[PDB]
Amino acid sequence: SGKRGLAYNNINLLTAFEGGPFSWSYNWEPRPGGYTAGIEYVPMLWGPRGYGSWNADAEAGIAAGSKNLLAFNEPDIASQANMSPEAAAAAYQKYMNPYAARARLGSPAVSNGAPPKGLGWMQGFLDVCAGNCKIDFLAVHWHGPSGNVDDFKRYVSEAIALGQKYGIGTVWVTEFEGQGDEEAQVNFLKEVLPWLDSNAGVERYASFFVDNLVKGGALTSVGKAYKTI
Ligand SMILES: OC[C@H]1O[C@@H](O)[C@H](O)[C@@H](O)[C@@H]1O
């Protein structure tokens, strides 16, 4: 309890979830797009496109009571932030480290791609950081067929171990998606949600994602499961 997050594009779609066991929200942007009473909004520095406004964006979100900031979104993937580990280590020290006295700082969020993507990219990043990146938690993503639940638990375990190796005590799984039809998607949530709630190495997580769990303004059967399990 208190771990479950709302990852959104349309802030209006959050209403369907009002009353459920949610503590936090993010929107892959530096600004929320509106106001949600009773939930922590966590601003994100997505990539180099956000460098210009980030100081302003980070001051605003902390003034509104966020305790956490998130760095770049899938820098290992060419259609997302598309940064080398070297460039990301230099950017993290310039734009993330300055706010450490006033917020806990999240790593760039890697995919579950095969090394040298994914957790391979995150090794590369910690190597170039070389102890000079201030990181409170690792941010990681997993997307795959609902039948590969065992691969999803191996991936989250290996992320927890990698952080501990570099004295980062927890992970946030800021996207996961057990893919398939609605029955397969609910079966995946029925397994992983209790396992993530019991896992001491996972501080926070968000299924991917609010706008796909709502039809009109009604929860799908997947959204209903994300609310009630
Ligand atoms: O569709 C959900 C979100 O997915 C992410 O992969 C993109 O980086 C965001 O900018 C987009 O809003």
Instruction: Write out the chain in H/E/C secondary structure.
Output: CCCEEEECCCHHHHHHHCCCCCCEEECCCCCCCCCCCCCEECCECCCHHHCCCHHHHHHHHHHCCCCEEECCECCCCCCCCCCCHHHHHHHHHHHCHHHCCCCEEEEEEECCCCCCCHHHHHHHHHHHHCCCCCCCEEEEEEEEEHHHHHHHHHHHHHHHHHHHHCCCCCEEEEEEEEECCHHHHHHHHHHHHHHHHHCCCEEEEEECCHHHCEECCEECHHHHHHHHC
Ligand 1 centroid–CA 176 distance in Å is: 13
Domain-wise residue ranges, the chain: 1-229
Q: Experimental method used, please?
A: X-ray
Residues framing ligand 1 (Cβ under 6 A): 9, 28, 73, 80, 209
Asked whether 185 and 219 are in contact (CB, 8 A), the reply is no
Whose Cα sits closest to atom 9 in ligand 1? Answer: 28
Give the amino acid at 82: N
Structure tokens at 70: 């998130």
Question: Which resolution, in Å, applies to this structure?
Answer: 1.9
Ligand 1 centroid–CA 28 distance in Å is: 6
Q: Which atom of ligand 1 is nearest to the CA of 46?
A: 8
Ligand 1 centroid–CA 32 distance in Å is: 14
Q: Which atom of ligand 1 is nearest to the CA of 208?
A: 2
Q: Which atom of ligand 1 is nearest to the CA of 74?
A: 8
Q: How many CB atoms lie within 10 A of CB 26?
A: 26
Whose Cα sits closest to atom 4 in ligand 1? Answer: 28
